[PDB]
Amino acid sequence: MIGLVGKKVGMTRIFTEDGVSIPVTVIEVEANRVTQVKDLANDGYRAIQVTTGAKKANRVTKPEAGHFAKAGVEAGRGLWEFRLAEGEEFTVGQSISVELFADVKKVDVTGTSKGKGFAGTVKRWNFRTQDATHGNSLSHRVPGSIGQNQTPGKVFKGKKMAGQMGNERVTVQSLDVVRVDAERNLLLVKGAVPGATGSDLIVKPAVKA
Amino acid sequence: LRIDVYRTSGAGGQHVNRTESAVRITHIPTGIVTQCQNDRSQHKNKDQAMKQMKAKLYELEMQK
Amino acid sequence: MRHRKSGRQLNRNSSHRQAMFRNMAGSLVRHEIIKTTLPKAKELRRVVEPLITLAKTDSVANRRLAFARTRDNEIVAKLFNELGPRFASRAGGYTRILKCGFRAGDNAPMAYIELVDRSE
Amino acid sequence: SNIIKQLEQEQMKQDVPSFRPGDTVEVKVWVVEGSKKRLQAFEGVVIAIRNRGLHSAFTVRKISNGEGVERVFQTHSPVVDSISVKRRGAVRKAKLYYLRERTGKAARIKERLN
Amino acid sequence: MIQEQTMLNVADNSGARRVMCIKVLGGSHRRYAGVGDIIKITIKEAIPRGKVKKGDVLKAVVVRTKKGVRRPDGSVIRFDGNACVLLNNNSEQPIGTRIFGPVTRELRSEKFMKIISLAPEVL
Amino acid sequence: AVQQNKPTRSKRGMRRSHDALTAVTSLSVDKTSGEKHLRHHITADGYYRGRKVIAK
RNA sequence: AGGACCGAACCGACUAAUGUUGAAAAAUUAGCGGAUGACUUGUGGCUGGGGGUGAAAGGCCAAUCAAACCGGGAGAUAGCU
RNA sequence: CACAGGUGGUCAGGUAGAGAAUACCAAGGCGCUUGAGAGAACUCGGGUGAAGGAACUAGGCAAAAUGGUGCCGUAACUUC
RNA sequence: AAUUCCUUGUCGGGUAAGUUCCGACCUGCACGAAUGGCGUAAUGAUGGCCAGGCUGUCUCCACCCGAGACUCAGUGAAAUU
RNA sequence: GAUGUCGGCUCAUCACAUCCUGGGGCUGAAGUAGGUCCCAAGGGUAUGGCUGUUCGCCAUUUAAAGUGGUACGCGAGCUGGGUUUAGAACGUCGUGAGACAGUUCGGUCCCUAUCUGCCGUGGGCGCUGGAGAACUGAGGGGGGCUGCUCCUAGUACGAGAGGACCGGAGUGGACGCAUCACUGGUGUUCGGGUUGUCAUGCCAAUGGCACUGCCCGGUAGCUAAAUGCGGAAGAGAUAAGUGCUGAAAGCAUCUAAGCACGAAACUUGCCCCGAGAUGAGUUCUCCCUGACCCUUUAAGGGUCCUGAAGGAACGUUGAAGACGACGACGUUGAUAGGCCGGGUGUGUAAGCGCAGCGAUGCGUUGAGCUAACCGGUACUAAUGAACCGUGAGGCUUAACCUU
Numbered sequence A: 001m002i003g004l005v006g007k008k009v010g011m012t013r014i015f016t017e018d019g020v021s022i023p024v025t026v027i028e029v030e031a032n033r034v035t036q037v038k039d040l041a042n043d044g045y046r047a048i049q050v051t052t053g054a055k056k057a058n059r060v061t062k063p064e065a066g067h068f069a070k071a072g073v074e075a076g077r078g079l080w081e082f083r084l085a086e087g088e089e090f091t092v093g094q095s096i097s098v099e100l101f102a103d104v105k106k107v108d109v110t111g112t113s114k115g116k117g118f119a120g121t122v123k124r125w126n127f128r129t130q131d132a133t134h135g136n137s138l139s140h141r142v143p144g145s146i147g148q149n150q151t152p153g154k155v156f157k158g159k160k161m162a163g164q165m166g167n168e169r170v171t172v173q174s175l176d177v178v179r180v181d182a183e184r185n186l187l188l189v190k191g192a193v194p195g196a197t198g199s200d201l202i203v204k205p206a207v208k209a
Numbered sequence B: 001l002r003i004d005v006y007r008t009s010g011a012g013g014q015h016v017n018r019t020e021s022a023v024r025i026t027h028i029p030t031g032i033v034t035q036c037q038n039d040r041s042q043h044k045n046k047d048q049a050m051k052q053m054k055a056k057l058y059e060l061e062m063q064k
Numbered sequence C: 001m002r003h004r005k006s007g008r009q010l011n012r013n014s015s016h017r018q019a020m021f022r023n024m025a026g027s028l029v030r031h032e033i034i035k036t037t038l039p040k041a042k043e044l045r046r047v048v049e050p051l052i053t054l055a056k057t058d059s060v061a062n063r064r065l066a067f068a069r070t071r072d073n074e075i076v077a078k079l080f081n082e083l084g085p086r087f088a089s090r091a092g093g094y095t096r097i098l099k100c101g102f103r104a105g106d107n108a109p110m111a112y113i114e115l116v117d118r119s120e
Numbered sequence D: 001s002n003i004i005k006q007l008e009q010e011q012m013k014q015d016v017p018s019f020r021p022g023d024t025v026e027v028k029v030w031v032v033e034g035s036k037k038r039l040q041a042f043e044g045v046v047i048a049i050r051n052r053g054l055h056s057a058f059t060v061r062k063i064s065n066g067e068g069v070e071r072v073f074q075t076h077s078p079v080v081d082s083i084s085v086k087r088r089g090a091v092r093k094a095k096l097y098y099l100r101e102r103t104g105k106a107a108r109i110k111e112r113l114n
Numbered sequence E: 001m002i003q004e005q006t007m008l009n010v011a012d013n014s015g016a017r018r019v020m021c022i023k024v025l026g027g028s029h030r031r032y033a034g035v036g037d038i039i040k041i042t043i044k045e046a047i048p049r050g051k052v053k054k055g056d057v058l059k060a061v062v063v064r065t066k067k068g069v070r071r072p073d074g075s076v077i078r079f080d081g082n083a084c085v086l087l088n089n090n091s092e093q094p095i096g097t098r099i100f101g102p103v104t105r106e107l108r109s110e111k112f113m114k115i116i117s118l119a120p121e122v123l
Numbered sequence F: 001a002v003q004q005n006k007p008t009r010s011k012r013g014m015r016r017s018h019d020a021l022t023a024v025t026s027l028s029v030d031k032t033s034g035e036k037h038l039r040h041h042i043t044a045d046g047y048y049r050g051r052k053v054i055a056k
Numbered sequence G: 001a002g003g004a005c006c007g008a009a010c011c012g013a014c015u016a017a018u019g020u021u022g023a024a025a026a027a028u029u030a031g032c033g034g035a036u037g038a039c040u041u042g043u044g045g046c047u048g049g050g051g052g053u054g055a056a057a058g059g060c061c062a063a064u065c066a067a068a069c070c071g072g073g074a075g076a077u078a079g080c081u
Numbered sequence H: 001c002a003c004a005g006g007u008g009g010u011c012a013g014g015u016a017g018a019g020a021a022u023a024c025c026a027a028g029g030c031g032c033u034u035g036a037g038a039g040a041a042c043u044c045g046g047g048u049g050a051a052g053g054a055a056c057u058a059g060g061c062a063a064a065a066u067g068g069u070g071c072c073g074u075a076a077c078u079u080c
Numbered sequence I: 001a002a003u004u005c006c007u008u009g010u011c012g013g014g015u016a017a018g019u020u021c022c023g024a025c026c027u028g029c030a031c032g033a034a035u036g037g038c039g040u041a042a043u044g045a046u047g048g049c050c051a052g053g054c055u056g057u058c059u060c061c062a063c064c065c066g067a068g069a070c071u072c073a074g075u076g077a078a079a080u081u
Numbered sequence J: 001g002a003u004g005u006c007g008g009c010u011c012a013u014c015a016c017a018u019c020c021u022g023g024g025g026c027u028g029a030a031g032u033a034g035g036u037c038c039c040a041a042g043g044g045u046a047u048g049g050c051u052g053u054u055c056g057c058c059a060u061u062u063a064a065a066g067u068g069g070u071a072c073g074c075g076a077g078c079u080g081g082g083u084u085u086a087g088a089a090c091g092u093c094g095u096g097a098g099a100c101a102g103u104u105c106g107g108u109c110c111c112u113a114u115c116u117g118c119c120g121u122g123g124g125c126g127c128u129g130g131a132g133a134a135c136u137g138a139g140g141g142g143g144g145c146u147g148c149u150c151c152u153a154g155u156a157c158g159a160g161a162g163g164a165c166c167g168g169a170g171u172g173g174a175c176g177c178a179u180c181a182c183u184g185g186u187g188u189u190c191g192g193g194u195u196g197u198c199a200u201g202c203c204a205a206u207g208g209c210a211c212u213g214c215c216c217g218g219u220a221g222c223u224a225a226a227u228g229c230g231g232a233a234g235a236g237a238u239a240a241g242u243g244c245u246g247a248a249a250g251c252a253u254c255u256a257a258g259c260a261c262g263a264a265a266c267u268u269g270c271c272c273c274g275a276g277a278u279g280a281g282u283u284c285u286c287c288c289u290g291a292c293c294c295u296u297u298a299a300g301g302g303u304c305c306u307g308a309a310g311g312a313a314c315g316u317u318g319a320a321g322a323c324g325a326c327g328a329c330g331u332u333g334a335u336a337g338g339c340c341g342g343g344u345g346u347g348u349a350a351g352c353g354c355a356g357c358g359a360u361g362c363g364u365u366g367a368g369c370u371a372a373c374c375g376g377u378a379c380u381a382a383u384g385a386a387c388c389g390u391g392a393g394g395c396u397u398a399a400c401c402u403u
C-alpha cells in the first residue's frame, strides 16, 4: 500500500485512562498533493509522485514551475515517490489526506536521520574502547587492528571503520499508530522516528504487518 | 585415554613459547589426570606421562 | 557535535572570551565604531546589544547590572544618559555590521562593527 | 511546536494546586489490585519539581519501614488522584537532593507559615 | 540495576546482613537485573544465630533498586540503596518469613505471590 | 609512515590540480561614484550602497 | 638529644602520563624520596689510562669506557664483505 | 637554535596562614614573535558523571579519596 | 622457602571458586650455621597476599571544557626513495 | 646492510572436520531425556577465581559455552605480565671467570602514511543542444540468535516416579537501528551559595583570579543505564533426508519417465547505498528560434551580435558539516543576530521602610535575572548589480504526414 510524506513537529506523550504513557510522535502530515501517477503503459511501473509544504512563487525554478503547472496544483518543498499496490487509481490533479491512514494499525516510517558527522569507530559501530589506563598509549578510542597479516594482504570491503554516520534516509519499522487527526493535518504514532524538528518524513504503511 | 597437548610454562625465547611439548593424559571413566612438561620432545613426554599414568592407574586399582 | 550549539568559541578559553567581550563592548561604546574580525564582531552583537537594551531602561538596578558586563563607570553613564535618548523608538537593531576587507598580516575577514546612529 | 503546545493544553490537568518544594504532601495514587483500581496514600516531602507543560513531574520523599523511598509522579496523569498538601516547607531551595542522605532530625526541615 | 560483585542489604530475617551477587541469572551474557528477577548470590555478612550461614551460595530475588523501577505511565520508584530476598535453590521460594521494607508492583506473580503477601507494604 | 618509491612529477602535478585556487568571479561596483570593490565588503574610500558610512 | 618527624628552598629520582625527525642527544607534567646530615653547594686544588677514582654498577673518568680522546706507527691486518 | 633544560650569592612590600608553603595583589616588569577560523574522529591536559564498586588488569597501574588545628581516644607486638 | 624438579605435593585457613598468599606437615631433586643459621621492635618510593574505604580501572561508556589535529593566509622541514 | 617472540586487549575474518539453534536417519528411541550417524556455517557461541600464561582446574552460568585457519590473524593498533640484554640473589654445577628447558626481585616497545587496501567524502569530465527534476534498479551491503513461561493438557505415553507432540500467545536476555516523550547523564555561554583575596573613591553592591576557585542546581543540545522498533511474517528453487507412482530385472525399485515436500544455507520478500550499470535506462518540465565572411568548401575557421534556462560565487546561514559537499533563505525577505509577548531554571535581587546592640531577619515581593526554547515582529545586515553558462541541436538507414 502507498505511503504519505510528512514533517516532524516533535515528540509528546499520551496519558491514557488505564494509566499507560504512550510516547507519540507528532508528524505534520499535510495535504499531500499528487503531481504524477506512474504506470505500466508508457512509464514502466506503478508509482505516485507526491508533494508537501509550500515554496515561494519567486524562488521556485522555471522547469519545476512548468512541471507543477502541468499537474495543476501548488508547489511544496520537494517531491517524493511511492510504489502502488495493484488495485489503486488516483488522478493527477488530486490531494491525499491522512484519511487513507485511518484504517491501518501499524506504519513504517522512513526519515533522514540525525547527522552524526564523522563518527569514530566506537560511536559508529558500537566498538569496545581499549583500556583508558593501564599502560595504554594514545589508543583509547581507536579501532585497534583492522586486518590480519600477510595472508589477506588487503583490508576487506565494507569493514567497520570510522566515517560518516547519519545524514541518511533510513526506516524505523512496525510502529503503532495511535490517533489520526484530519482537522489539523496530524499523524500520531507510538515511538520515535529519524530526524530533528522539521525533518521531512516518509511514512509508509505496514509492509511487514 | 584422553591425550591433550599444550605449551610449557617458563623460559626459552621463541622455541618453548611455540611448542606443544607438554602433555596431559586423563583416564576417561576414572577422572585421574597425569601431566608432564619435563623433556623438550612431545613424544618422550607422551610416553613418560603414560608410564606415569599407568603407574597412577595401578595405585588407583591397588588402593581400591 | 554542535547540534544547535550557538555561540562561536573564537579559540579562546571561556573566561578569557568573556573578558574580551567586556572589553570589546566597552570599546564599541566609546568609539562608536571598531574595526574587528567578522566572526568576533558577530559574537559581540549578542552581548553588547542586550546591554544597550538594558540601558534603554533607566534605573539604579539596571545601572548596577551594567556595571558588570560593561564594567566601566564612564561607559555605563554614556550608555544610560547619552545612548539612552539615542535609541528610544527602535526595537533591537542597535548594531550595524559592515565588512571591509582582510587583516593583511594573517588574512582575517575584517568588518566594522558600529552603532546604527553614527551620523548624528 | 505550536500545534504540539495546543495538543498539550487540552490534555493537561486543570485542577492542579500551586504546590511548593519541601512541602509535606499526601499523594493519592491509583494502584491496580487484581482487576479493580484502588487508591493508595503516599505522604512525604516534595524534593523536586519538574515543569514541562504536560510532561511535568514531582518527586516525593519518605522513609518506609527503614529504607527511604523516592517516588517521581507524573503530574498530568489520571493515576495521581489527589495532591493533598498538609504543611509547607521553609527552604531557600528547589531541588533538595541532600535529603537522599539526610536522615532523622537532619531530615526534618523548617515549616513555612507565610 | 543489580549486577555481578554487587553488595545488597538483606530484606528478610533468614540470618544474613550483606549479600553479594555473583551471577545475574536467567539468560546468556545477562548483566542488569531489575525487581522480581532471580540472581545467584553469596552470603558475606551473617547474623550469628540464623538459618543461612556465611559463605553460602543460593539464588535470590531483587526487591529494591537505587537505580529506580518504572511504571507503564513513566513514573519511577527509587530506593535508598539496593535490597534482596533470599530464596531456596531447588523450590525457588523464600527462606525467610518476616520481610522488612517496601516491595514493587513488578514483583507480583505466581512465584512471588507468597512474598508479596508476607511484605507489609507494596509499591 | 614513509614513502617506499619516489612518486613521479606527473603524480604530483595531478595532485596539484585541485590545490590551485579559485579566482574571484568578478568585482563589485558602487552605483554612485563607480568604485570597484570586493563583494559585500566596503570600498577603499568608505562608500557602501552609494553612501559614505566610514571616514577611514 | 637526635644519621628523630612532617614539610618548603635545596638535593634527588620511585611512579605514571606526555614527548620519541622531542620544547630537550633523558626533558616536562602531575604526583614521589631525603631534607642538621654518611647533607648539599659555590670557588680553587690534586689523582691520567692498564692508569685514576668507585657506599662496587665494570659505574664514572668532557653527550665515547670491560680500558678515554688525539696524533703517529699506519695505506695494521681482514682466507671476509 | 631567540632551545620548556642547566647556573652561585644579595634584597623579601599587603591580607590570610605555623610558614620564603599556597593564595590573590604592591613595587616592578611582562602577554611567552605566527596568526585567522571553524568547532569531525582521534590524540593530548582536564571537569563531571546514574547504578554498581575492582567485576579492570599481570598488578587498584592510573584515577578517586584521605588530608588542617585543638580535644577525646588508641591494639598486637616491642630493643620499653 | 628469593632454594622443592616431581608439583597447582598433601592437609588446614582465607575465597562462590585461590597455580598466588598465610599456617602446618617433611619425601631438604639440591637449607643450614659468620660465601653465617634462626628469631626480631622499628624502618622501606622493598617483594607477595588480604580487608575496609574510595573511586570511570571496569561493566559501558556518555557528555562538556580547553591545546592540537581540519579550513585560510604566512613561512617551511624531515626520515625515505 | 633485522622476518619483533607467548599471552592479554581491540578488532576480527574465513573454514567446516557444527557446540547450540534448525532439518533428518537409526536407536538397546514407552516419554522426557538422550546416544550416535547424515545434512546444514544464517546467526549466536559466558562471567569470574587461580596462574604471565594459552591450556587447564574450579565456581557459577547458558540454547550452547565448537574445533581450527588466518606470520598457531592482528605490537608503523595498545600492553609488556611471560620471555630475549645489561643489576641482584637462591639453589645447584664449575678451582675460577661464570653458567643452568632451575627459581627469584628489578628492568626505554620508535615511526607525521608515498602507494595498495579500506572507511567515508568531494572536484573534474563523461553519458552527444543545454539545463532542472522525478525515478527504475545491474549490482552491492545491512539485518538473519534465541531462550523461559502459559494456553492446547497433567492430556497422545505411561506399573509407577513421572511427564511427553506439533501450533499459538505472552515475555525476556545478548545484538542492531531509531530517538529524547519519559527516567536520568552531561551541561566551564543560566541562576544561586560560599572560602580566600584583590579592584571598582568609600558603605553597600559588584567584578577578577584561584582546576568552572570550590560546590548546589539546572535551559537547549548531544547522549544511555532510557523507550520505541527490528531479528521479520513469510515466499520460491533446495541440501541430507522423506517420499509418490514406475521399468530395465513378469518380483522389484526416491528415478532411468513424471511428481511432491525438507533448515536459519541459496533466489526473492524487509531496510539502505546505488545508471561512472561507459550496456551510462526511462519519464516530466523548462529554455536559447540571430546576420555575415575567409582560405583549403566543411562535424573547418571564425566575426560581430545575443546571454536564455540554469549555475556558481558571494552573503546570510542549518539539529549539513573536518573541508568541499548537502539543505534553507537574499528585502516580495523571519535567513541570522538582537527585540517584543510567552515558556524553562534558580529561590523573595537591589533600592526602600521596620525590628533588633548588631550579626541578621521582617515586610516590600515567588521577587529580579535567565544560553541554545516557542511564537510574533524586518530593528540592522544579507542591496542595485556583475561573472561562467550560450545560441533551436550532428551522420547513416529505415517505420509514416502523402502506406
Ligand SMILES: [Mg+2]
Binding pocket: A128, A129, A130, A131
Ligand atoms: Mg574492555
Ligand SMILES: [Mg+2]
Binding pocket: A135, A137
Ligand atoms: Mg608505556
Ligand SMILES: [Mg+2]
Binding pocket: A137
Ligand atoms: Mg610511549
Ligand SMILES: [Mg+2]
Binding pocket: A136, A137, A138, A139
Ligand atoms: Mg593516554
Ligand SMILES: [Mg+2]
Binding pocket: none
Ligand atoms: Mg603489524
Ligand SMILES: [Mg+2]
Binding pocket: A152, A153, A154
Ligand atoms: Mg595478495
Ligand SMILES: [Mg+2]
Binding pocket: C011
Ligand atoms: Mg589556533
Ligand SMILES: [Mg+2]
Binding pocket: none
Ligand atoms: Mg631528618
Ligand SMILES: [Mg+2]
Binding pocket: none
Ligand atoms: Mg617532579
Ligand SMILES: [Mg+2]
Binding pocket: none
Ligand atoms: Mg623517613
Ligand SMILES: [Mg+2]
Binding pocket: G067
Ligand atoms: Mg686494550
Ligand SMILES: [Mg+2]
Binding pocket: none
Ligand atoms: Mg685499512
Ligand SMILES: [Mg+2]
Binding pocket: H002
Ligand atoms: Mg621566542
Ligand SMILES: [Mg+2]
Binding pocket: none
Ligand atoms: Mg609561590
Ligand SMILES: [Mg+2]
Binding pocket: none
Ligand atoms: Mg554514583
Ligand SMILES: [Mg+2]
Binding pocket: none
Ligand atoms: Mg579478568
